[PDB]
Design a protein around this nucleic acid. Structure first.
Length: 149
DNA sequence: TTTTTTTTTTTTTTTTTTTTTTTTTTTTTTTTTTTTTTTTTTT
């Protein structure tokens, strides 16, 4: 089988999915992001190819809250999985608290809570606590989440 | 009869897409007015 022209298809598949990410329908881009996130969380040493990098950055800055929360969910699961090597994505993550949705804020707060529980002695604990306390008055559901956390 | 994990069902939250609905002039109609037009009365 490893001689046959099927085992060397996975590469192709990624490329195909990444052609999709620039398109003009929201649901399709959301699903592309979720499927890519699942792929990434299976084989965590795939956030290396430069095209995937530029893809997830672009979609992190995208103009619709659905794909934004999808992208931040990918990045958060990747950070939680690999304990170290996250000091490079923390800045682009913690930029996203101020993101004018209610999805993205809740997702970033959940990811931050799991960080602050799982691997203490991380350097940026104080700033994380300051920002989460800062958002205590922002909304209602978010308020409940921060209060119980 | 009453407790527990696993599974099953409900329900709850939050976005995106469609849907009735309010408004915003524009035009039409109809009744009110009033000015002119028409019609006897009288000094």
């Amino acid at each position: 089988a490893s001689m046959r022209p099927f085992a060397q298809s996975f590469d192709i598949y990624l490329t195909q999915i990444l052609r999709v990410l620039g398109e003009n329908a929201i649901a399709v881009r959301t699903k592309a992001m979720k499927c890519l996130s699942e792929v990434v969380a299976v084989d965590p040493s795939i956030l290396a190819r430069l095209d995937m990098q530029r893809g997830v950055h672009g979609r992190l800055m995208d103009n619709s809250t659905s794909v934004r929360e999808a992208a931040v969910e990918l990045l958060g699961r990747f950070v939680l999985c690999r304990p170290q090597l996250a000091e490079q994505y923390y800045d682009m993550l913690i930029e996203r608290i101020l993101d004018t949705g209610i999805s993205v804020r809740k997702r970033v707060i959940k990811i931050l809570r799991d960080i602050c529980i799982e691997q203490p002695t991380f350097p940026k604990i104080t700033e994380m606590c300051v920002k989460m306390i800062r958002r205590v008055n922002d909304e209602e559901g978010i308020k409940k989440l921060v209060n119980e956390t």
